[PDB]
């Protein structure tokens, strides 16, 4: 009998309740005050142009059919009640494949306040598309969107709202960051209208401003690229007569850059435009190829095949000595121009 009081309340709420019809159908728009508490910002898969996000996706709307009076002001209920009531058919416009976790039970809470207000929260892992323009990659920053709205109901039928000030209606947990190669600088939220083949729809946009960390790509790509440029420019300080040795330097170094250039792309989508690393690779490719062409030029004028001993001996090539200082200055000037151009953008 102690719980029979609340059983008779829940039975009354669903008596004659048609969960196919939205609140205020034909009477008013259904305002759904939404909020997102990002328990953890999942990893970003640049290869698939998508990111994962774990959220306590909160939705609140007024349903006058669920007004009740009783010894409690807020009925805290399990998910089983949620499927019995109308809930917004919210979906994510750029959602690729999302999971509504239900271990051990459906991770959904449904609180019904005495005035009819509902608080319908669910735990989701949303895998959303992030259209990524990798022009400045890896020194790039992306405003990955998280758009959601009603799938069926037009703006005249349901409209979405932020439950607090828009700046204060998307909260990220303090330790909730599963990003490896990114920093969540923050989020900006906006609400607009999207015109579709079926009608006008309200779309709540959230732009998570992610800035990539170059720490991985500096170790993985730039240092091997730079040390390959410096490995090639070691050949200048070797005697010209050592034809196999300097030849091994150029072919191995050029071979290394081809491996590195192929390797770098493999972690990226197969975009048809050059990224900022491609130009760095291309210039580094130019600097190792020039260092083999430089040796080929030196080998052209290498009038003798025997190095110094202890009977004219080949002099040190003026191309080498100029290349000794020119190639590390030109390579250094390129880095200053390259790094300054990309690092100082905003």
């Amino acid at each position, epitope marked *: 009998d102690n719980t029979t009081v609340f059983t008779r309340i829940l039975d009354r709420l669903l008596d004659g309740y048609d969960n196919r019809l939205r609140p205020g159908l034909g009477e008013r728009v259904t305002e759904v005050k939404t909020d997102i508490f990002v328990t953890s910002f999942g990893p970003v898969s640049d290869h698939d142009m998508e990111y994962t996000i774990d959220v306590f996706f909160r939705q609140s709307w007024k349903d006058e059919r669920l007004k009740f009076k009783g010894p409690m002001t807020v009925l805290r209920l399990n998910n089983l009640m949620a499927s019995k009531i109308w809930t917004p058919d919210t979906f994510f416009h750029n959602g690729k494949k999302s999971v509504a976790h239900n271990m051990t039970m459906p991770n959904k809470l449904l609180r019904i306040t005495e005035d009819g207000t509902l608080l319908y929260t669910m735990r989701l892992t949303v895998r959303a598309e992030c259209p990524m323009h990798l022009e400045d990659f890896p020194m790039d920053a992306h405003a990955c969107p998280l758009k959601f709205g009603s799938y069926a109901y037009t703006r005249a039928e349901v409209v979405y*709202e932020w439950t607090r*000030e*828009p*700046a204060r209606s998307v909260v990220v947990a303090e330790d909730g960051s599963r990003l490896n190669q990114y920093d969540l600088l923050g989020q900006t939220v*906006d*609400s*607009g209208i999207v015109q579709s083949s079926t009608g006008e729809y309200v779309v709540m946009t959230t732009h998570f401003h992610l800035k990539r960390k170059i720490g991985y790509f500096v170790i993985q790509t730039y240092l091997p690229c730079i040390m390959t440029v410096i490995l090639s420019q070691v050949s200048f300080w070797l005697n010209r007569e050592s034809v196999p040795a300097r030849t091994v330097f150029g072919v191995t170094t050029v071979l290394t850059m081809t491996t590195l250039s192929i390797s770098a792309r493999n972690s990226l989508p197969k975009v048809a435009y050059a990224t900022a690393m491609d130009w760095f690779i291309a210039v580094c490719y130019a600097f190792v190829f020039s260092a083999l062409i430089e040796f080929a030029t030196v080998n052209y004028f290498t009038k003798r095949g025997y190095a110094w001993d202890g009977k004219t001996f080949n002099s040190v090539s003026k191309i080498d000595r100029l290349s000794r200082i020119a190639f590390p200055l030109l390579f250094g000037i390129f880095n200053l121009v390259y790094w300054a151009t990309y690092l100082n953008r905003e």
Partner: antibody
Amino acid sequence: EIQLQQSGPELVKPGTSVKVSCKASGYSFTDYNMYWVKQSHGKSLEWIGYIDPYNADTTYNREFKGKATLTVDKSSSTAFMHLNSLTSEDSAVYYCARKRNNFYFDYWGQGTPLTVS
Amino acid sequence: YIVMTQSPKSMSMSLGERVTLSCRASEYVGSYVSWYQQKPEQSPKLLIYGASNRYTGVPDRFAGSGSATDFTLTITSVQAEDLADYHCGQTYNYPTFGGGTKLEI
């Protein structure tokens, strides 16, 4: 129709306290928040705070934190603002602004001049 | 908070002449920007919300647009009743209205 009717003109001296009310009509009070706004003579509008009428939660501006208190009567539709330790700088006209959405302030109050001298 | 700055503090546009009123935000506000009309001894009256939309029961002469941190209200041809102060607000965060802009003939 909707119409917000505030208290009216007030005359006071520094150090006293004044309470100004903001009645609401034409819509359910608990549905929407109520913001309070100050505007000195020929100056930009300034936000004091807002009160959630349902649960009576309040948020205040840092400039007016501790200077004013926001209270609400759910039974009779009215939002109350009380000022204490008044000074000459607080002589201004005060408005109460409904917030229909997170986009705009739908209906504003008539305006309550305040005089301190 | 976020401060809104009306660049032209005052104007002298003639009746029946196009006029532009600029509004700037110190940082992002999205589309959450609105314009209100403050006649002397009258409370503000909303004209433009969402930085592009127009409140119901408003003349079509009031046209406003803008992007993030750059918002403009343009009146194609002002009338006698259109002479008043204009305030641009932002509700992307705790609300903060900008300095008024007034018109003269």
